[PDB]
Amino acid sequence: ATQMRLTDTNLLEVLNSEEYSGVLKEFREQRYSKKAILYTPNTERNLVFLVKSGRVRVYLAYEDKEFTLAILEAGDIFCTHTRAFIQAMEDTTILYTDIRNFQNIVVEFPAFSLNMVKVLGDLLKLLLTIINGLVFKDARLRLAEFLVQAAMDTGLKVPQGIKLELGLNTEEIALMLGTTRQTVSVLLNDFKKMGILERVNQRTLLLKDLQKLKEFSS
Amino acid sequence: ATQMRLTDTNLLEVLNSEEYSGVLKEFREQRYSKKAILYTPNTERNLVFLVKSGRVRVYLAYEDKEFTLAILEAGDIFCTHTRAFIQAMEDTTILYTDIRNFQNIVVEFPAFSLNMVKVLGDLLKLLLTIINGLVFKDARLRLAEFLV
Ligand code: HEM
Numbered sequence: 001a002t003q004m005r006l007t008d009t010n011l012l013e014v015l016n017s018e019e020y021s022g023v024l025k026e027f028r029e030q031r032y033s034k035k036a037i038l039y040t041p042n043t044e045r046n047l048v049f050l051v052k053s054g055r056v057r058v059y060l061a062y063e064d065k066e067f068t069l070a071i072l073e074a075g076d077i078f079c080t081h082t083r084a085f086i087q088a089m090e091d092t093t094i095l096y097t098d099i100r101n102f103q104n105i106v107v108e109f110p111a112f113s114l115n116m117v118k119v120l121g122d123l124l125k126l127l128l129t130i131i132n133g134l135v136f137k138d139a140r141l142r143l144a145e146f147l148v149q150a151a152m153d154t155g156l157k158v159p160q161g162i163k164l165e166l167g168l169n170t171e172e173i174a175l176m177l178g179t180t181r182q183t184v185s186v187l188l189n190d191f192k193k194m195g196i197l198e199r200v201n202q203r204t205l206l207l208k209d210l211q212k213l214k215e216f217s218s
Numbered sequence: 219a220t221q222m223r224l225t226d227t228n229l230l231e232v233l234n235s236e237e238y239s240g241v242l243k244e245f246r247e248q249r250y251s252k253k254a255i256l257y258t259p260n261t262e263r264n265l266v267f268l269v270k271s272g273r274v275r276v277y278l279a280y281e282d283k284e285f286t287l288a289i290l291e292a293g294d295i296f297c298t299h300t301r302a303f304i305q306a307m308e309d310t311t312i313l314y315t316d317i318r319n320f321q322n323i324v325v326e327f328p329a330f331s332l333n334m335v336k337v338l339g340d341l342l343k344l345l346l347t348i349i350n351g352l353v354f355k356d357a358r359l360r361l362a363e364f365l366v
Pocket of ligand 1: 048077078079081083084099102103116119332339340346347
C-alpha cells in the first residue's frame with residue numbers, strides 16, 4: 001500500500017451484487033467538482049463514505065503547507081471524524097451515511113465488517129510506514145521506497161521494465177513525501193542518470209531497473 | 219439519549235460477555251515480563267492481539283535509534299506484520315489469535331468490529347498527531363540537525 005493507492009479491495013462489486021440492494025438505499029449520493037473540498041477537519045457531521053467514482057485526496061494542512069496522507073479511489077472507504085482535509089482531485093461521486101446508520105449496516109452484511117477491518121489494518125500499516133520514512137529516511141530514500149512499493153502494487157511489466165502510471169505530477173509526489181517539487185525533480189533525474197528509470201510523461205515513469213532501486217532503498 | 223449497548227463497551231467487557239464466550243476461546247493467552255520483546259517487524263506469524271493487562275510500547279527501530287509510537291493499555295488491539303516492535307513495559311498479559319481466525323470472528327460477529335474500530339481509531343488519531351508534528355516543523359528541521 002502507498003499514499004497513491006490504498007487497497008486492491010472491491011467494495012463496489014459488493015454494493016451492487018446479489019444480496020446488496022437495500023443497503024444502497026441507506027446511502028445518500030453527493031457529487032463534487034474537481035478541487036472541491038468534500039470535508040474539513042471540523043465537520044460537525046460524522047459520516048462514513050465511499051468513493052463511487054473519481055478520486056479524492058486526504059491531507060493534513062497547516063498554514064500554507066500540506067501533506068498528502070492518501071488518495072482514495074472508487075471502492076475505497078473513509079470517515080469524516082478526522083483532522084484531515086478531503087478534496088476532489090477530479091469530478092467525484094461519493095455514497096455516504098451517518099455513522100449510526102453505518103453501524104447498523106455492518107451487522108446486516110458481515111462483508112462490510114470484514115472490509116472495514118482490512119482497510120483499517122492497511123491504513124495502520126501505511127501510517128507506520130509514513131512515520132518511519134519521516135523519522136529515519138531522507139527524501140531520496142522515501143522516494144525510492146515509494147517507487148518500489150508503487151511498482152509492487154500497480155506496476156505493469158513491459159519489455160523495457162515496469163511501467164508505473166502514477167497519475168501524479170512532481171508536485172503531487174512532493175506533497176506525499178514532505179518535500180518540495182524541486183527536490184523531487186532533482187531526485188528523479190538522479191535516478192535517471194543511474195539507469196533506474198526514465199519519465200514517459202509528467203504522470204508516468206519507466207522503471208528500467210527495479211533491483212538497483214530495491215538495492216538503493218537498502 | 220440512547221441506552222448503553224455492547225457496541226459501546228470496551229473489547230474485554232464484550233469478549234467476557236456471555237454471547238462472545240465461543241469467541242474468547244479463539245484467543246490464546248500469553249504473559250510477558252517487564253521489558254520483554256513480544257514482537258518484531260520480523261515475526262512471521264500474522265496475528266491480532268489485545269492487551270488484557272499491563273502495557274506495551276510500540277516503536278520503530280533503525281540502527282542504534284528508536285522512535286516510540288504509542289503505549290497500548292488494557293483493551294487496545296494491534297497486530298504483527300507492521301514496521302513496529304512491541305515491548306512490555308511491565309508484566310503484561312495479551313490475548314492473541316491468527317489473522318484467519320480474527321477474520322472468521324469478524325464475519326461471525328460483525329458488531330465486534332464496531333468495538334474494534336472505536337479502539338483502533340484512538341491509535342490512528344495518535345499516529346496522525348505524530349505525522350502532523352513531523353511534517354509541519356519550521357526552521358527547527360536544520361537546527362535540531364545540530365542537536366543530533
Ligand atoms: C472504514 C471506515 C473508517 C476509516 C477508514 C476510519 C479512519 C479513521 C482515521 C484515519 C482516524 C484518525 C483520527 C484523526 O484524524 O485524528 C479515525 C478516528 C476515529 N474513528 Fe474512524 N474510520 C472509519 C470508520 C469508523 C467507524 C464506523 C467508527 C465507529 C464509531 C469510527 C470511530 C472512530 C473514532 C471513535 C476515532 C477517534 C476520535 C474520537 O472519538 O476521539 N471510525 N478514523
